[PDB]
Amino acid sequence: MIKVEIKPSQAQFTTRSGVSRQGKPYSLNEQLCYADLGNEYPVLVKLTLDEGQPAYAPGLYTVHLSSFKVGQFGSLMIDRLRLVPA
Template sequence: MLKIEIFPENVNIETRVIPAKDDKPSRTIYEQIAYAHLGGKFPVEMKLQLEQGQPAYVAGLYAIHPSSFVINQYGSLELKRFGLLIEPISGK
């Protein structure tokens, strides 16, 4: 199981604005730093995208929620491009 960890120092939301370009309006992105345990010696830093108004995830261990996966047009399993959700893992 892929584990995602959020440390106490990463329970805040980082906001960044992508400026308007051509006919597209500016966009505000809400992110939280997390760490993916990919099997190496150390976890790898990643960013979780959050929806506007969504509270930050609390510190702890998480797994990817099943709703974050889709079957693509070739019948293969993949992560959704947007809307990644995680859920707490009970016990460490």
């Protein structure tokens, strides 16, 4: 399991916006977190939230299976990092 932590300073999201190729508006909500990848300290990672989902609250989390998909070359990829409480 990947240990992910939302620190108290990371409790909010920011929103970026724009227009798609054929005219549809979009909005993306982004939040920061720390993920322990086994180095001397955890590293900073950007999260893009799913539609209608609030920011994750401060605390410890692990990664949900729905984060993964098989990519167009047949290797596993992260689609969007989705978290669940530890």
